[PDB]
Point group: C5
Chain length 311, copies 5
């Protein structure tokens, strides 16, 4: 089939629309997610026009291999979409009404800075390539863009499925292309972190600090060193889903902070003993008494330093 000819010199307006049936499987690592949805496209292919008087029909149905349809595709997809044609109904004037049930893995990037409170905007990029005879421009039919009430993305809170109304029109490989931006807004469900990560990962750090209430280097080595294992152990129980960072995570900084508060504790206890062994248990007692407040205070302040910086 041939592309529709111009009424005057204008490009073809293809009125897009995506309705999310089911949205799932967000791999924080790969920065992907799978989407199951309806794609409704509208265009005036004048050629198709039929009179209601002569044709006994109302709105004639058509097959995809039976009529011309523009090459509508996605940009940030793994493999091409799992398209399944629903209906192609042509209005008496020649206005086609395309519908399909696509199922493809999207590839939208994520922000792991603000994590575990991280908030995201996922992208779906609709593209259509212009031909040798006429050109194509995309439009957002505001009425066939949305999300079902049944859509669940366990771990995230689906806020609003929107669309960037203005299209991008550009040249590439000697052809005009129309690029649309579909934006999905999500926020994180961080409820479990506090009681099952931050609160237990804190307790471990405090069992470490019971070394300043001791005099015994033999009990403090077993305190500070053991809790370090306890940390890495729990740090392993909590192995999440977080890729390679050329930047810093809000957690990334906190983790680097703990790996110091254990090491610093090791210095303190190594000195607490060496000062006492050299027979000056006056500093060696002022130093232990100091870190009783120094560590907790420095820590609480260091958390505010991070929080104020990141957020």
């Amino acid at each position: 089939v041939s592309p529709p000819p111009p009424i005057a010199d204008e490009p073809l307006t293809v009125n897009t629309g995506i309705y999310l049936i089911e949205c799932y499987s967000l791999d924080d690592k790969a920065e992907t997610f799978k989407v199951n949805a309806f794609l409704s496209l509208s265009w005036k292919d004048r050629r198709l026009a039929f009179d209601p008087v002569r044709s006994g029909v109302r709105v004639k149905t058509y097959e995809p291999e039976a009529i011309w349809i523009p090459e509508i595709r996605f940009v940030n997809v793994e493999n091409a979409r799992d398209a399944d044609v629903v209906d192609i109904s042509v209005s008496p004037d020649g206005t086609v009404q395309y519908l399909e049930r696509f199922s493809a893995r999207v590839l939208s990037p994520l922000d792991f800075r603000r994590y575990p409170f991280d908030s995201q905007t996922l992208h779906i990029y609709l593209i259509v390539r212009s031909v040798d005879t006429r050109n194509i421009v995309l439009a957002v039919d505001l009425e066939k863009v949305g999300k079902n009430d049944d859509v669940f993305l366990t771990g995230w809170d689906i806020e609003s499925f929107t669309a960037v109304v203005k299209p991008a029109n550009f040249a590439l490989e000697d052809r005009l292309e129309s690029k649309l931006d579909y934006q999905l807004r999500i926020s994180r469900q961080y409820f479990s972190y506090i009681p099952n990560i931050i609160l237990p990962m804190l307790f471990i750090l405090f069992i470490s600090w019971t070394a300043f209430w001791s005099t015994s280097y033999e009990a403090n080595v077993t305190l500070v060193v053991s809790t370090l294992i306890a940390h890495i152990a729990f740090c392993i129980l909590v192995e999440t889903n977080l890729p390679k960072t050329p930047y810093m995570t809000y957690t990334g900084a906190i983790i680097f902070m703990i790996y110091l508060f254990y090491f610093v504790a090791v210095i303190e206890v190594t000195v607490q003993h060496y000062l006492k062994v050299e027979s000056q248990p006056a500093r060696a007692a002022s130093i232990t008494r100091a870190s009783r407040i120094a560590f907790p205070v420095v820590f609480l302040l260091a958390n505010i330093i991070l929080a104020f910086l990141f957020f």
Copy 2:
């Protein structure tokens, strides 16, 4: 082919039916499972009608590309169903009897609150989209809905495969749609938990409490700290199949409880030593003697507090 015309103004009644051949692979994480089953649909497509006198035949067989069949689909499926047409037999009046052997990964959500005693209702959503000329409504042919005696879901106990008789009829993208709810009821096989999780994960917590029967801070640090590793170690051997929770698990609360009974034990032993070092081994002896009953009693009561709350 064209949809059947109305005898008067009524929509087409498609009499559904699902018989579970094989049910397997329940991923607690993704909240999915794979199903292998038979789909039997019945409708009066008057057009097909043939006389028994003129036609030498009884009940004529037909091909899927040879006759009109309504677009029957599933809502909560990963990728579209692996449909394999069995038989399409038309009764003399024009009553079609469709049958297929679909094989698709369902996406039904789960309740991890009551876990490891968690009980579930899984969902299969049958949908059919209405056309430009007539509309479609779904019905439950109570006689072709069930499960085979051979169906196994190791880890769960398959109770009853049912169907929500009343259909949902609603508008979406300017089209009428009929939505049916197929419900599968399952309960958990928690037998191994008690002797291979709760009972060993308890023993570790008790080897911790043998610190109140000691006077030695050097043996109690090695008791309480070591068992914490022993816990996280076993807690790692027991790494299950449990996604992200914006709520609380019955186990989730218990785990948070243990991470306290170890930390609290650390406080006790840090004080038991500090009281004795400051030369008051009267409290330091009343405090150790107290926790001999305090910890076990507080613990047993704390378990009842949880159990009564969750269940």
Copy 3:
């Protein structure tokens, strides 16, 4: 095409046959395995009959879409079989000789009781559905049922590929169905367990018992507690392929047994110290001397109690 008409009122006999080309990938967890094999079916479709005198041919070859073939399927398969038609040759009388190279993931359940010495019978269920005009019954052509000499299932010992000669004939969804049972017998290759699981997992349990040859509570806490970590650590190195058990494994009981022999050892050492601290190092010395024999003897006997019960 139409099903063959009856010579008198009899159902069609389809003479089955499965020859295992390659058998592999047994997932103990999912209770599955993949099979690559040949399916040879024989039936007298009288219609096809051709005279050797008039037809210049001997045994005419035919295409699958060129002739009627009964809907032969498998019951316990993940997704439908990866069928690849080999040859369809019709004998002068009309006796068809079907052959294909199917490749599908089977779903046969397993017995993890007797494990690591567990022995299995895997199932392949061949089904054929009867039509509106005649019915179908299955037969075992004893000559085209077997296994190649090259078949390997590393970890198991392929004993005998058999077939349940008698077919199951039953009603379901108003249709007669013929169900055949293909049984594959396998046994376990447990050679590595003894020297790389039971023997090292024993040694750890004995380094624990060197606590009765000590007087020092500080060395016994470090003995008994450390070895518990050593156990869970090795118990983690040995993380196998074993699903959810609503019953008990032979290993399951042994594991529960070890988690006691460590806990019991903890009681002993907690008492050994508390008796000595209360100044009665007469029992505290009789109790330590007792467990020198009590633990080993109780243990060896407890293993016989299990072995005699399970086997």
Copy 4:
């Protein structure tokens, strides 16, 4: 299409050829690997013959569904090969020149005895099934068998892609079959093992032996027991890709050996203490002094015992 008729009574000679484009993904566990290659087959199908004088053409090209091609398949493949037809060119006499770009996962078994120095011969089994009218025998066209210079199997060293010239001709399911053996020879790249497995896994075993340079049972329990954890810990960092063994690995024996040298060390230290506690620090001092040489010597000799046995 029909198989070519005999010039006299001979079977058809199909001249095979495999050229490895890309070879990758060797799963030591499943004993598989994926191969991307070219399959060139040559046969004299007399029927196709065309005169150079009458036909304006030279060597006529043909489609796969346009001409007869023998059912060429693989035996040890997961699912059937991902065949992609390249060219089918027929020489004036009727000599067909088939070519395709197959991509399938092979299933060749491995030897884990000599590991990490293990050497392998992988198998590709080409099969062709004979028909009702003529029979088929396979030949190795020595000129279209090889491997590209770009082929990489990181972890192995690709030595030589060969072919077993002599074919296997046998009866199965009343049909003649021709079986060819394609052999790929590979050897292991064990460079990292010595400095990042054997050398660190040795150091751990030596930190254990610093127990004979001590008198203190409290420091030796903490030495020998701790290093056992250190071992299992590192033994876990080194968790490779090695299936179930009904035999013994060269490493399998070494591992069983270390799990003794730790246990034996536990006996020594338990006696070193018990002899000294019973007041005979003359043996208890001869025994400690003995194991200073006994363990290292016994060990070095035990390694030679293994190496000489395995290799």
Copy 5:
């Protein structure tokens, strides 16, 4: 269809072009990555030529099965490319303009020497096979080779998508083949390594060295041995994506170095005690005092020895 005949004796020039739509999933292990891109090919197939005067058309569109297209393929691909034809437009002279949207997993090897600062050149090998009548040579249409501004490879920094202008022309299996080299240049995003690997993996190594500030063999065994576990533990938290090395990694050397600085520390502490036990606490005090500087200095120098060697 037939290949275009020569204007004189020249081979056909196919003007290639690859524009990277989306580039993702780089598996350091398998040495692969997935690419989604546009392939534009240009050739003068004189046969297609049509006059602008007689033909009412301008630049006639054509189907792939409607015209001859050369067998353009990739060499280092897993399975054949997921090709999706965009447009085939023929200019009045007969100059075809092919375009497709391929999606295949590439197989380019990597350098893990300079890692985590490793820099790579990935390969895409375009091949075209010559026929019985004319031959084919490849060309780089410099104008349709590039990468989009949206291309992201999280963990790497996409530098420049280039092409080796000069083609490789060689004989293989009696056929001429044209091989092109597409090179993608990437560099690593090593920001997180320093604060979340090297800095914490250093701290652990320093808590070890607080053994020279002690006199107590019982506290030094618990220091040096415990930190070794802490190391292997963290070394496990940091389990990356790094295959089998027949060479040495920059990290590979550093890791081997740490496994010595712990072992050497074990020797020191075993001697520190044995010298003191033999009553010579003059060396035993000079040796401990020495390693206070010896270890740090030797270490810092050993890092420069590596860095200068690798880089």
